[PDB]
Amino acid sequence: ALQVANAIIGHYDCTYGGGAHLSSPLASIAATNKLCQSFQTFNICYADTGLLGAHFVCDHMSIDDMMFVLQGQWMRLCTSATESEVLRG
Amino acid sequence: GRQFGHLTRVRHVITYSLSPFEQRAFPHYFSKGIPNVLRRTRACILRVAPPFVAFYLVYTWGTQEFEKSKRKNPAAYEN
């Protein structure tokens, strides 16, 4: 389920075709507002523990916006996930 | 105003930090705090305290003279 959620959020890179239309809200907002140069979600697993989150690369004046959006998406999924996005994930 | 991201240039400093939910809010409140206040007290008494005892001394004297001079007084008028 964590990976399914992570797929929904996706990843992004400034060489992706089509940005504004991307499914992931993080991805599309990042592409339209140039908040990012890249970002990716991840689920590192180790025995009985692991790292679950995201890493991103950006300009000095966009870290605050990138975090706001990244965090809005986790929250949104926690409390508000819809059905078709889960299917896509 | 000024915004984070445009303040100034800093190179080479690492800051390590903990989550509040991971640490104590009062660790050695007394063990380390008391000593600390004693130390800040020592560091400043010589500059803060003296002018005030100077006022204190003038405060007690000044009122003392006032009472003895006027009221208490009527000293000698002897005939």
Swiss-Prot record, chain A:
UniProt function note: Component of the ubiquinol-cytochrome c oxidoreductase, a multisubunit transmembrane complex that is part of the mitochondrial electron transport chain which drives oxidative phosphorylation.
Signal peptide: none
Species assigned in the record: Bos taurus
UniProt subcellular location: Mitochondrion inner membrane
UniProt-recorded name of the protein: Cytochrome b-c1 complex subunit 1, mitochondrial
Entry similarity comment: Belongs to the peptidase M16 family. UQCRC1/QCR1 subfamily.
Residues of the full protein shown: 303 to 391 of 480
Oligomer status and interactors: Component of the ubiquinol-cytochrome c oxidoreductase (cytochrome b-c1 complex, complex III, CIII), a multisubunit enzyme composed of 11 subunits. The complex is composed of 3 respiratory subunits cytochrome b, cytochrome c1 and Rieske protein UQCRFS1, 2 core protein subunits UQCRC1/QCR1 and UQCRC2/QCR2, and 6 low-molecular weight protein subunits UQCRH/QCR6, UQCRB/QCR7, UQCRQ/QCR8, UQCR10/QCR9, UQCR11/QCR10 and subunit 9, the cleavage product of Rieske protein UQCRFS1.
Top-level taxon: Eukaryota
Swiss-Prot record, chain B:
One BP annotation, GO: subthalamus development
Membrane topology term: Single-pass membrane protein
Main subcellular localisation: mitochondrion
Gene3D superfamilies: Cytochrome b-c1 complex subunit 8 (1.20.5.210)
Subcellular location: Mitochondrion inner membrane
N6-acetyllysine found at: K32
UniProt keywords, alphabetically: Acetylation, Electron transport, Membrane, Mitochondrion, Mitochondrion inner membrane, Respiratory chain, Transmembrane, Transmembrane helix, Transport
Entry function: Component of the ubiquinol-cytochrome c oxidoreductase, a multisubunit transmembrane complex that is part of the mitochondrial electron transport chain which drives oxidative phosphorylation.
Name under which the protein is recorded: Cytochrome b-c1 complex subunit 8
Organism: Bos taurus
UniProt gene name: UQCRQ
